């Protein structure tokens, strides 16, 4: 029972040159309050209009009322652009429910490729991935965005094998065999090459594990903890690839995929 | 060409992955070419699209559900198959879903379903068996607050259950009755077995899994029917259970 609004929405973080705050009407979608420095790192309309069209559905999902925590991790990513081809910049955002009418304030921080000053120490370039037996990503942890160039939503529900170098795909078959064989005990395997947003591959040192349904004994998820031992040749992992986007065919990928899923259908006694 | 290969009460269709409805077959349900999604319920069109995007279409039969129109809407379990130098289609096997408490009622001991949710207490999944027994399709519960679904009375018991879940380190345990709201608005009573999936490196819980047995169904056997009633403490409570789960083990 408290409405900040007006200037009470103040709480500068600068004193980051890459952050900004914004309050958005939960009913209108209109930008009620917008923090300064925005034009710097680059209005008054619907905030979604400045987001990549693919990230709009994402923004609404994570800003849904029955979610979010009242102002006194639950953060998502969005590419923002002050119009223009158009130029976007990835932003990590944390949503907070706040009254002005109850809206939603968000702290947005510009994200930087972990391969460029300030470069993420190699011993800490660690991210994890989770996937279902059908081999489609289920989640990618936040540490992955800076090391891959993709935002979580770009990889969720897509073939795991597609991101792997074509010569490291058949390896996945043996990796899963050991995974259900290991019955949950993590094990190392390297190197595996994983494709980033800019079409460049990074070399990973991976530890594999699985979550086993105790009642059915069937594997529910495959979890990997990755350490990028060799980053890409081009440090800006968010740039675009000079290749005609992705595709659909995936001749061998489909084959290898169903082959693995079949394998993971067996109970792990 | 092969129409209705794998097979009563259930029909089939083949849809162009570029346009609409090519093949359709034997109708049967007592009640009476274009885009297939036109017949689907609005809120399921996205579901149908998602489960039929080419890079997902290929046993256990990893299907999905959605309501098709009549005249009225009925729940259907559909299994998508990618049938291919000419036309690339998606062969869909359909099958009317019957209330678990209806004529073909599921035997007591078999009225079992499971649920999974993330530390933030929002459903990440609900298995196939949950539909016939609860009236909801997975898409209705996914990403929604698990607490909102429990009887307002049983809600507090959820803070205790999670604490034990934390203390259990993965060891499953049975819990007294908890009341779960079904689609038609009625509460069913459950005998629940709880467990968790612990990330092996950070030792934090990634998913809470529950296996439920329905020991008391609803008075109105038709669980898919609409609820005879309109559609903060839950928000706050959720924040407690959420905070609590940030603790490692061990």
Residue numbers in the entry:
A (entry chain A): 168 to 182, 187 to 213, 221 to 250, 265 to 276, 281 to 296, 305 to 473
B (entry chain B): 179 to 185, 188 to 212, 222 to 247, 263 to 275, 283 to 295, 303 to 449, 455 to 473
Which sentences from the paper describe this structure?
To provide insights into the PAS domain interactions of PERIOD proteins in the mammalian circadian clock, we have determined the crystal structure of the mouse PERIOD2 fragment mPER2, which includes the two PAS domains (PAS-A and PAS-B), the αE helix, and a short extension N-terminal to the PAS-A domain. The mPER2 structure was solved by molecular replacement using the refined dPER structure as search model. The structure revealed a noncrystallographic dimer, which, in contrast to dPER, is mainly stabilized by interactions between the PAS-B β-sheet surfaces that pack against each other in an antiparallel orientation. Interestingly, the PAS-B dimer interface includes the conserved Trp419 (corresponding to Trp482 of dPER) of both monomers as a crucial interface residue. In the homodimer, both Trp419 residues are 80% buried because of stacking interactions with the preceding Pro418 as well as van der Waals interactions with Ile427, Arg429, Pro390, and Ser413 of the dimerising molecule. Overall, the PAS-B dimer interface is predominantly hydrophobic and also includes two centrally located phenylalanines, Phe415 and Phe425, which establish stacking interactions to their noncrystallographic symmetry mates. In addition to the PAS-B β-sheet interactions, the mPER2 homodimer is stabilized by interactions of the PAS-A domain with helix αE and the PAS-B domain. In molecule 1, the PAS-A β-sheet surface is covered by an intramolecular interaction with residues 170–182 located N-terminal to the PAS-A domain. Notably, the αE helix of mPER2 contains a nuclear export signal (NES) comprising residues Leu460, Ile464, Leu467, and Met469. In contrast, the single mutations of Trp419, Ile427, or Phe415 in the PAS-B dimer interface of mPER2 to Glu disrupted mPER2 homodimers under gel filtration conditions.
